[PDB]
Amino acid sequence: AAKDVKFGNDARVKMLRGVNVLADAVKVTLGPKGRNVVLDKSFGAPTITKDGVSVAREIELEDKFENMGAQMVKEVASKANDAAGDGTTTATVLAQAIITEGLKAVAAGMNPMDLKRGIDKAVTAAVEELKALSVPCSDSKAIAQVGTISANSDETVGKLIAEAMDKVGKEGVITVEDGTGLQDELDVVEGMQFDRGYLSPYFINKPETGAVELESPFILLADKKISNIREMLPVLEAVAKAGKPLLIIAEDVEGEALATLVVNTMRGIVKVAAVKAPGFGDRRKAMLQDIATLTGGTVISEEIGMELEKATLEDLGQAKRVVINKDTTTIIDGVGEEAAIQGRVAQIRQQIEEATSDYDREKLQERVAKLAGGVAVIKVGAATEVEMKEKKARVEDALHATRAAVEEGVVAGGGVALIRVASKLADLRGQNEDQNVGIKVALRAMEAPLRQIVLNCGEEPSVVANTVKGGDGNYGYNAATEEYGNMIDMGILDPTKVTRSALQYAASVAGLMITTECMVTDLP
Amino acid sequence: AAKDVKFGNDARVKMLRGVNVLADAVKVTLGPKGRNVVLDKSFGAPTITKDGVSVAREIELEDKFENMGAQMVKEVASKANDAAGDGTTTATVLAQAIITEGLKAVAAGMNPMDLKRGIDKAVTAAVEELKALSVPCSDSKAIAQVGTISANSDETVGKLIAEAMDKVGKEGVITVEDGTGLQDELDVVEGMQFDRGYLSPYFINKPETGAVELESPFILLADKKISNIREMLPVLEAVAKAGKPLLIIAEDVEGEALATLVVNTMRGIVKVAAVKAPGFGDRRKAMLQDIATLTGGTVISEEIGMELEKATLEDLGQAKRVVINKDTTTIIDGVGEEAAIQGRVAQIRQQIEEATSDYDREKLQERVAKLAGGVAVIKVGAATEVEMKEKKARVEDALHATRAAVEEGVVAGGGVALIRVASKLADLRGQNEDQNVGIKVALRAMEAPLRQIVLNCGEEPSVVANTVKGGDGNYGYNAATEEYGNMIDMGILDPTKVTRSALQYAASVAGLMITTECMVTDLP
Amino acid sequence: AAKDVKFGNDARVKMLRGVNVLADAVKVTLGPKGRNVVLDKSFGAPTITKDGVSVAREIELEDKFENMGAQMVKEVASKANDAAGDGTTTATVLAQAIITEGLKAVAAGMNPMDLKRGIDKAVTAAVEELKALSVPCSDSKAIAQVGTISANSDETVGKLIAEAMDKVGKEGVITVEDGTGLQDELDVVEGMQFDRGYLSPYFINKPETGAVELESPFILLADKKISNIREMLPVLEAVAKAGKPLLIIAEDVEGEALATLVVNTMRGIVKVAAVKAPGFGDRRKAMLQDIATLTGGTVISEEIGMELEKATLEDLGQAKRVVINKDTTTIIDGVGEEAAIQGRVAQIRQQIEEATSDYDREKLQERVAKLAGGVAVIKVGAATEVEMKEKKARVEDALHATRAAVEEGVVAGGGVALIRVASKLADLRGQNEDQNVGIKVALRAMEAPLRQIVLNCGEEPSVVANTVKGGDGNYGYNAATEEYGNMIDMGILDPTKVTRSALQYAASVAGLMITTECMVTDLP
Ligand SMILES: Nc1ncnc2c1ncn2[C@@H]1O[C@H](COP(=O)(O)OP(=O)(O)OP(=O)(O)O)[C@@H](O)[C@H]1O
Ligand SMILES: Nc1ncnc2c1ncn2[C@@H]1O[C@H](COP(=O)(O)OP(=O)(O)OP(=O)(O)O)[C@@H](O)[C@H]1O
Ligand SMILES: Nc1ncnc2c1ncn2[C@@H]1O[C@H](COP(=O)(O)OP(=O)(O)OP(=O)(O)O)[C@@H](O)[C@H]1O
Ligand SMILES: [K+]
Ligand SMILES: [K+]
Ligand SMILES: [K+]
Ligand SMILES: [Mg+2]
Ligand SMILES: [Mg+2]
Ligand SMILES: [Mg+2]
């Protein structure tokens, strides 16, 4: 199609316009007194949110060049959310500041590539300064403080997050879902629990709750399909001689074997329950091996050279507790040597280190948690569905910030650490005066977050920034309290990863935008 | 459909308009201080690029006559990128200069074919002068310098390119892909490696990394399908008697044979690993023959008159190392006579010389590299995706320029070589005064590259061109440094192939355009 | 649909408008200083061409009356290109002149049918005069001159055409294709060659070249599909006893026979190569009979009453050389009596004389060339694709003109012969003063070509035409040289067929167009 071509100042003005529109839409949610943004939904009611990336992702402009600017600036928020899950609004504000300063530097007729070089140098120095200024976030108090800061000053969310990591541990998995009541709740599960119920309600040994209870039972891990009873007469006789319950974790059990087992349960011969093997395919085999390791048994598969008829008591795993219900089976305290369990979790961690997809990494981490860690479920409770969405978004932001703080430490929140970095980097000079101008662009830029946080609170961004600059260390301005003091002491902790990634992505997008001279787009 | 027909001056003005629009869009990226262009993408965010052909290929004009002008001038950039992969912006600038001068000459009422003849004569003489002025580029310093020049003054890209060429060698293959971190990395593989993993995780002899290790093993190259164990009882017994590991590179292994082999591995009988034969079809047979030559074995195929049951230890290839993982198998230091390997690579090179498609040539060169050379992979690391694209484009341009410089030598960069050629070709005269006008058209034209390079730097193209003309040899104007000096000294090297091809394509397009008088296009 | 109807002068003005538009578009490429035209291509790049029929075929007008006038005048160029392949622009100019003069006469009360009668009489007399003035073009110098004239003053094209005709001969076939380099090349093939490679790479006795070489081999021509080896046990044993190589030109060879033959090759028993029979269907049978005649063998078919098992050494053709590669097999110096070969080519020539389709005629001529003549391939080399197209069009025009000159002789080029004819026909009178007006119309008309050729050179068409008329014989005006002299001596030779056909078609279209009084067309 025929193309519209822009050169020089027109394209730069269009980028500035799109960036300014997107940043103005996003930044109103920054800081403790940032307000909410409601996004129209064609299919359903409009959604109320405070997350900056959510607001940024819904921005599109009729003007094609300004649309280009909005798209290129949205990458900062997108990548900031992708990396740490927090500071997306701070990332957008930083990007807008860098874009503004660099464009007005370009307007002087001066070389844009040298501006990009200076901005990159200054931002690398800023990342180093932030890493040096990072202080570890390991205590539950600091975790709760980080969660509160990221959840828009919500102590309950940070407290629940710290409790989840404390109960579950570092190697466990913590997830957030919607609740049924008006309050949040936390559930912790240890051991292996897989979403596989009993294959027959007649296996239920307690009609009051409809559950199957197995005390110190054998576990037959069949990596195969059980179709005929004849394949498992030997193991059934072995179980009957042993007299202990049996749990058959198989791919599935057909009608004949299921009928025989349910008959034998109420005939008093063998107390046998049958459940399906969790997972599908290679993940099913991996989970079966995990169950074998934790229960000290051998998975029954034809691919290794053994048959179900040849299986004996040794090939049967053992566990202290087997809980079964309509949906889930939990194997609690299986007899498993810690050597095999730790070897298996080491193999899973090695696979994690060679896992690129986040889904595979999460599944492997959940497998480790079932083997060694735990599973936490946090249900969000409130009255309405918009409150569902907003509170869940705040909880997820708090969880991301808490994890980032745990893994990388904390720094003074509210843009105070960035002001300290700017003070420490006022001496940086590049290859020429042009890279010096780029460095000064970055230095003027990273003071934007505190200024915008204060602006959302209705106070003076300039006076606050000047007073914070006159201070040192963690001295700064609590925007929720509107008072000058130490950010670390009064709980204003920002993850170092969040700020560092936000600044890096903002700089990377803005420096390349600086060198723009021309656009080719479609005709309106 | 009804056709719009133009004649004479209006049509030539339309061609000049389209050429000027396309050249103005392209030339902003020329020179070390050239700026880059952001191109809007309908599917995704706009892409920031500095490659001239990339900007040229996105140009389309609403006016059908100017659209034809843009299309006909785009051929210069397209062919320049196709030939050497660099100098596309220089090609576009040269084409625009030749078009402008030739159309101006036509505006005087003089025969256009005489301009075409004079331009062709002058450009042929210029190609001869560039070939004579070409100095070889074999040292790694010159290669790194060429890469830096083509990568928009990036020393790291040229250094990595020189390192890859040195480690891998001349007959190897070097490729560039995107990385995962923020920095570029280089990986070199010597020997033979094919993307085939083990057919069973039970073949893994090291659960820590999930890999199969075979030390001094036999190699059974089956150019067939292995279905029954009975076909390989003789070779299995021979391997067991030998006691050395075995690697079966076959088309595929079914369930029965795979189960038997995995059983025998953990039963201690034979340490056997099975992988699929790389390639599909005739290329699979060629790769199997390559493996046979490198490992000194015989490929097992029914088309030659021998059977798998009749195969013995002699038909089994041997190698010092066999590495297998989930995806790849490397045969390291196979026992292969250099006579057979060199004959095979000679046959592959003969096929290359009779290979028209670039894909077939690349595959054959990769086969030679596996047999004799190596494989280099350069991962581009940076914060954002637009930086992915821009840095990878710069790296690819640098790689193309370095290869062109290695194969054809270097000349003084920044358009100095063309100015020297113009000084040496000021005496050329054609069949008539009109062909002399065409020669002067070409002579005025090839001074355009330095002028545009300096213009992108904000200095005086005319003063710079005059000062360079007053100089001699490689004396010129470093546009990045903005200083006069010998371009060879500070590393401003341009491949002779790049400039020669660019000038040839520009002249060939422009000379044929000049003789145009009439236009037939569709009605708007 | 409702029809728009025109009568009398308005319809004739519409005819003249369409004719004039098409002729003005076409005639800009006439003569040595004719221009080039760029035609817009919706699917691909616009094409630069100088061929008159190519420009004519792309002309369409919005006005339906002028559009149908353009359609009827396009028939002159179309038929001129169909007949001789050259002089299409001359045909268009002649048609425009005849149309203009006839319409001018009609406007004065002329009887249009009498104009048609007089024009036909004068043009028939002109054709007779051109035939009488034709001088044979048999020397390679005249052929090269004709090619140069038709290739827009390109000596190389005419020289290559003459060389191809000399090497290949009169009964051979010469074709023009695009090359890979920057220069034209000529390849001549004698004997017979068919595009069939070896059926197995194991047949290759020369792996360095990947070719099957057979010295004094038997030739088994199987007009059948061979499936089982048992069919060639007799002839395989006969060949083994003979000990000479064997080439099986069959419809195809299946897996069992191919495997047995490839086994027997490397076993040193029989040197057997297998290739597919060229052609499909009746043409395959004819080509197999051609191979039998040239190699002195018998084609093995079931339709005659003999079987492959009953075939002996006598049924096997013999030859001196058999060349096979991945694609082609050539039989060089087959032992074939000239009686059978000449009888076969006589039958093919008889089929040619009864062949209406040009494709069948070309295939039969190629069969004769394989049996008796040769095959020439001329590759066009140049930098760009538009130059591919333009140079190939010039080469094809030169080839057509050279063939027409060889078959019918030459006359003075540049419209000089037409002026001589007009001078010789100034005395022709028809049935009445009306047919005299028609004759004068034609006489005024055929002086147009030289006038337009000179007009394309920027000189005076009237002064040039007057000076040429004042001359005699081949005295005329070299428009490329702009000098008066003999056309024949300086190499401006025009094929008599080209000019005669052009004039005939122009007269036939124009005389009928003159007799029109009413138009019926669609409503806009
Ligand atoms: N009491 C406070 N005093 C000063 N600054 C504060 C205070 N509470 C929060 N902040 C700052 O305000 C910001 C928190 O705003 P908010 O959580 O809405 O957005 P964000 O951290 O930029 O990212 P996201 O859009 O992903 O939620 C951080 O920069 C934080 O340091
Ligand atoms: N320091 C320098 N001083 C002078 N000229 C330079 C310098 N560095 C590069 N050049 C010139 O500038 C040009 C390099 O620009 P650039 O690499 O962007 O485009 P290109 O070589 O025309 O091709 P492409 O569009 O394929 O990248 C070359 O003509 C080179 O000779
Ligand atoms: N040097 C010359 N001096 C005079 N007339 C010439 C000269 N060279 C060519 N001509 C004339 O010019 C014409 C050749 O032009 P051109 O080959 O472009 O078109 P054409 O022969 O009419 O047909 P086509 O359109 O098929 O190419 C012929 O009439 C030829 O006699
Ligand atoms: K926010
Ligand atoms: K460029
Ligand atoms: K022509
Ligand atoms: Mg936040
Ligand atoms: Mg370049
Ligand atoms: Mg012609």
The gap from C-alpha B468 to its chain's centroid, in whole angstroms, comes to 32
Distance CA C26, CA C94 (A): 12
DSSP 8-state secondary structure symbol assigned to residue A253: B
CB C4 within 8 A of CB C522: yes
Interface contact A452, partner B, CB < 8 A: no
Q: Around A15, how many Cα atoms within 13 Å sit in the side-chain half-sphere? A: 34
**Alpha carbon of residue B80 to chain centroid:** 13
Q: How far apart are CA B47 and CA A420, in angstroms?
A: 35
Pairing verdict, β B516-522 and A218-222: unpaired
Q: Given in angstroms, what resolution was this structure solved at?
A: 11.9
Q: For ligand 1, is residue A92 a contact (CB within 6 Å)?
A: no
How was it solved? cryo-EM
* B199 conformational bin, left if phi > 0, alpha if psi -120 to 50, beta if neither: alpha
Strand partners, B317: B219
**Alpha-helix residue ranges (DSSP H) falling in C296-357:** 338-353
The CA distance from A317 to A297, in Å, is: 4
Terminal-to-terminal C-alpha distance of chain C: 11
Q: What phi-psi label fits residue C125: left (phi over 0), alpha (psi between -120 and 50 degrees) or beta?
A: alpha
Q: Is the CB of C479 under 6 A from ligand 3?
A: yes
Euclidean distance between CA atoms C47 and B267, whole angstroms: 73
- In angstroms, rounded to a whole number, what is the distance separating the alpha carbons of residues A176 and C25? 76
Cα(B276)–Cα(B197) distance, integer angstroms: 7
At C453, the amino acid letter reads: I
CB-closest option in B5, B304, B512 to C25: B5
Bridging pattern class, strands B36-39 and A516-522: parallel
- Name residues whose C-beta falls within 8 Å of residue B101's C-beta, 6 or more positions apart in sequence: B440, B441, B442, B444, B445
Cα C470 to Cα B105: distance, rounded to the nearest angstrom: 36
* Atom of ligand 3 lying closest to residue C34 CA: 18
Kindly write down the DSSP assignment for every residue of B412-461, as one continuous string: ETTTHHHHHHHHHTTT---SSHHHHHHHHHHHHHTTHHHHHHHHHTTS-H
Other beta carbons within 10 angstroms of residue B349's beta carbon come to 15
8 Å CB contact between A1 and A523: yes
Of the candidates A233, A286, A238, A280, the one whose C-alpha atom is nearest the C-alpha of residue A260 is A233
Question: Is there a contact between C441 and C107 (Cβ–Cβ < 8 Å)?
Answer: no
Q: Is C58 on the interface with B (CB under 8 A)?
A: yes
b/e for C15-42, b at 16 or more Cβ within 10 A?
A: bbbbbbbbbebbbbbbbbbbbbbbbbee
- Number of residues written out for chain B: 524
Tokens matching residue C260: 């047995």
Q: Which two tokens stand for residue B376?
A: 């280099």
Residues lying with their CB under 5 A of ligand 9, a single-atom ion = C 86, 150, 397
The residues after which chain A has a C–N gap greater than 2.5 Å are none
Question: Which residues share a beta bridge with C282?
Answer: none
Is there a contact between B25 and A515 if contact means CB atoms under 8 Å apart? no
Nearest-Å Rg of the Cα atoms of chain C is 29
> Nearest to residue C384, comparing CAs of C159, C47, C55?
C47
A226's torsion region: left (phi>0), alpha (psi -120 to 50) or beta?
beta
DSSP A477-495: EETTTTEEEETTTTT-EEE
> Cα B115 from chain centroid?
34
Nearest to C347 by CA among C296, C290, C304, C281: C290
- The single residue listed with the structure tokens 């091809």 is B501
Query: Cβ–Cβ of C60/B2 closer than 8 Å?
Result: yes
DSSP state of A229: G
Residue B102 near residue B115 (C-beta atoms within 8 A): yes
Residues 6+ apart with CB under 8 A from A228: A256, A257
Domains and CATH numbers, chain B: 1-134+410-524 (1.10.560.10), 135-190+372-409 (3.30.260.10), 191-371 (3.50.7.10)
Provide the phi-psi class of A31: left if phi over 0, else alpha when psi is between -120 and 50, else beta: left
Q: Which two tokens stand for residue C133?
A: 């003035």
Contact A515, B36 (CB under 8 A): yes
How far is C39 from C61, CA to CA, in rounded Å? 15
Residue type, A272: V
Q: Any alpha helices (H) in B202-295, and if so which ranges? A: 233-242, 255-266, 282-295
The values of phi and psi at residue B162, to 5°, are -65, -40
Task: Round to whole Å and give the CA distance between B242 and B218.
Answer: 9
Which amino acid, B96? Answer: Q
Question: Strands A483-486 and B246-250: what pairing?
Answer: unpaired
Residue type present at position B315? D
**Interatomic CA distance for residues C209 and C207, integer angstroms:** 5
Q: Which atom of ligand 2 is nearest to the CA of B31?
A: 12
C-alpha span between B446 and B423 (Å, rounded) = 11
User: What span, in angstroms and rounded, lies between the C-alpha atoms of A115 and A313?
Assistant: 73
Long-range Cβ contacts of C177-181 (<8 Å, 24+ apart)? C177/C377, C177/C378, C177/C379, C177/C380, C178/C379, C178/C380, C178/C388, C178/C392, C179/C379, C179/C380, C179/C381, C179/C382, C180/C379, C180/C381, C181/C381
- The phi, psi pair for A404, rounded to 5°, reads -65, -40
**Residue A504: which of B37, B39, B383 has the nearest Cβ?**
B383
Nearest-CA neighbor of B236 among B268, B288, B272, B199?
B272
Please state, in angstroms and rounded to a whole number, the distance separating the CA atoms of residues A308 and A300: 6
Q: List, in order, residues 6 or more apart from A517 with CB less than 8 Å away.
A: A7, A8, A11, A112, B28, B35, B36, B37
Axis crossing angle, helix C433-445 with helix C112-133, rounded to the nearest 10: 50
Pairing type for strands A192-194 and A329-334 reads antiparallel
Please give the distance, rounded to the nearest whole angstrom, from the Cα atom of residue C89 to the centre of ligand 6. Answer: 5
Question: CA of A84: how far to CAs of A176, A400, A448, A501, in Å?
Answer: 17, 6, 20, 7
Beta strand segments in A381-425, E: 410-412
Find residues 134-193 of chain B whose CB sits inside 8 Å of chain A: 152
In eight-state DSSP terms, residue A277 is: P
Nearest CA in chain C to B286: C201
A385 touches A45 (CB < 8 A) = yes
Cβ-Cβ contacts under 8 Å for C49 (sequence gap 6 or more): C29, C36, C37, C39, C55, C389, C390, C393
Answer yes or no: are the C-beta atoms of C87 and C502 closer than 8 Å.
yes
Q: Give the integer Cα–Cα distance in Å for A492 and A477.
A: 10
Handedness of CA B235, B240, B244, B250 (dihedral sign): positive
Quote the tokens at residue C472. Answer: 């005699």
| Helix locations, C84-152, DSSP H | 88-106, 112-133, 140-150
Q: What angle do CA C123, C125, C126 make, to 5 degrees?
A: 60
- Residue of B34, B19, B14 whose CA lies nearest to B94: B19
Please name which of B151, B22, B91 lies closest in space to residue A518, comparing C-alpha atoms. B22
**What's the gap in Å between B80 CA and the centre of ligand 8?**
11
DSSP string, B37-100: EEE--SSSSPEEE--HHHHHTT---SSHHHHHHHHHHHHHHHHHHHHTS--HHHHHHHHHHHHH
CA distances (Å), origin C50, targets B109, C42, C73, C84, C478: 19, 20, 19, 17, 19
- Which ligand is nearest the CA of B480, by number? 2
List of residues 6+ apart from B397 with CB closer than 8 A: B51, B85, B86, B150, B151
Instruction: Assess contact for B500 and B131: CB atoms under 8 A.
Output: yes
497-516 of A, contacting B, C-beta below 8 A? 504-505, 507-509, 512-513, 515-516
Q: Give the separation between CA B118 and CA A6, rounded to whole angstroms.
A: 36
SS3 of A326-356: CCCEEEEEECCCHHHHHHHHHHHHHHHHCCC
Residue B119 gets the label, from left (phi > 0), alpha (psi -120 to 50) or beta, of: alpha
Q: Which of B143, B178, B173 is nearest to B157 (CA)?
A: B143
**Strands B317-324 and B212-215, sheet pairing:** antiparallel
B495: helix, strand or coil: strand
Residue for token pair 């009255």: A383
The two three-digit tokens of residue B228, written as one number: 């029954």
**Do C209 and B305 lie within an 8 Å CB cutoff?**
no
Between CA C284 and CA C306 the distance in angstroms is 19
